[PDB]
Write a protein that binds this ligand. Structure first.
Ligand SMILES: [Ca+2]
Ligand SMILES: [Ca+2]
Length: 211
C-alpha cells in the first residue's frame, strides 16, 4: 500500500512540522528517493489514540512501508527504505559510517553548558575538525559526488547546531573550517532540506526549556 510516516509537530503548533532531527532524516530520505508518502503530524504533548495504538510507547518517528506495520528507529527505517527503493542509492560505505557521529551530542552538551571553561567547546570543535578533514579528503558529500544516508542523518543535526548555538550563545562554526561551511551551505539549500526543516523560531522554542 501507500507509504506513511508519523513525525513530530512543532510545540504548540499541531499542524506545523517540528524540528525532530530523526524524523527529518526519514523525510529527507523519502524526498531524495522521490518516494510518494503521506506525512502525519503528531502533537507529542497531545497524542491521538489512533497513534498510541500503532506506537504504544509514543515513539516518533514511525514508518509504514505499506506492509501492514509501523516501525520505529530512524536507522532501521532508512535501511528499510533503502532496501525497498534502491535508486538513487543512498548507501554509505561502512568505513564512513561514524563520520561526525559525536557532533550532535557534543553540541547538546556545549549548548546546555553554563560554564565557559568546562571544555565542551573544545570537544565540539574537535569533532567539527574531524568532519573538516574527512570532507577535505573525500568531499563534497560524505561519500564523494553522490549524496548518501550519512548526509541525511548528519544535516538535521548540523542545522540544530548552527541555529541554536548562534541564537543562545552567539557562537558560529569557525570560518577556517571551510569544507564544513561549504557542506552545510550545500545541504541546507537542497530542495528536500528546505521542504522538511523546521522554522527556526520553532527549533529555538524547542531548545529554550532545555537550556
Ligand atoms: Ca499549527
Ligand atoms: Ca526559518
Amino acid at each position: 500500500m501507500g507509504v506513511e510516516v508519523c513525525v513530530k509537530a512543532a510545540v504548540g503548533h499541531p499542524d506545523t512540522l517540528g524540528d525532530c532531527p530523526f524524523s527529518q532524516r526519514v523525510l529527507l530520505t523519502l524526498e531524495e528517493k522521490k518516494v510518494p508518502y503521506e506525512m502525519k503530524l503528531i502533537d507529542v504533548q497531545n497524542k491521538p489514540d489512533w497513534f498510541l495504538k500503532i506506537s504504544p510507547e509514543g515513539k516518533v518517528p514511525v514508518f509504514n512501508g505499506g506492509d501492514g506495520k509501523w516501525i520505529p528507529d530512524s536507522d532501521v527505517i532508512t535501511q528499510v527504505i533503502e532496501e525497498k527503493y534502491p535508486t538513487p542509492s543512498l548507501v554509505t560505505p561502512p568505513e564512513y559510517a561514524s563520520v561526525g557521529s559525536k557532533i550532535f551530542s557534543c553540541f547538546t552538551t556545549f549548548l546546555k553548558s553554563k560554564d565557559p571553561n568546562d571544555g565542551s567547546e573544545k570537544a565540539l570543535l574537535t569533532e567539527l575538525q574531524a568532519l573538516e578533514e574527512h570532507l577535505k579528503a573525500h568531499g563534497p558529500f560524505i561519500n564523494g559526488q553522490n549524496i548518501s544516508a550519512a548526509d541525511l542523518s548528519l544535516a538535521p543535526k548540523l542545522y540544530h547546531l548552527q541555529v541554536a548555538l548562534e541564537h543562545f550563545k552567539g557562537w558560529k562554526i569557525p570560518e577556517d573550517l571551510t569544507n564544513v561551511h561549504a557542506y552545510t551551505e550545500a545541504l541546507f539549500s537542497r530542495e528536500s532540506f528546505i521542504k522538511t526543516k523546521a522554522a527556526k523560531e520553532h527549533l529555538i522554542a524547542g531548545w529554550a526549556p532545555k537550556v
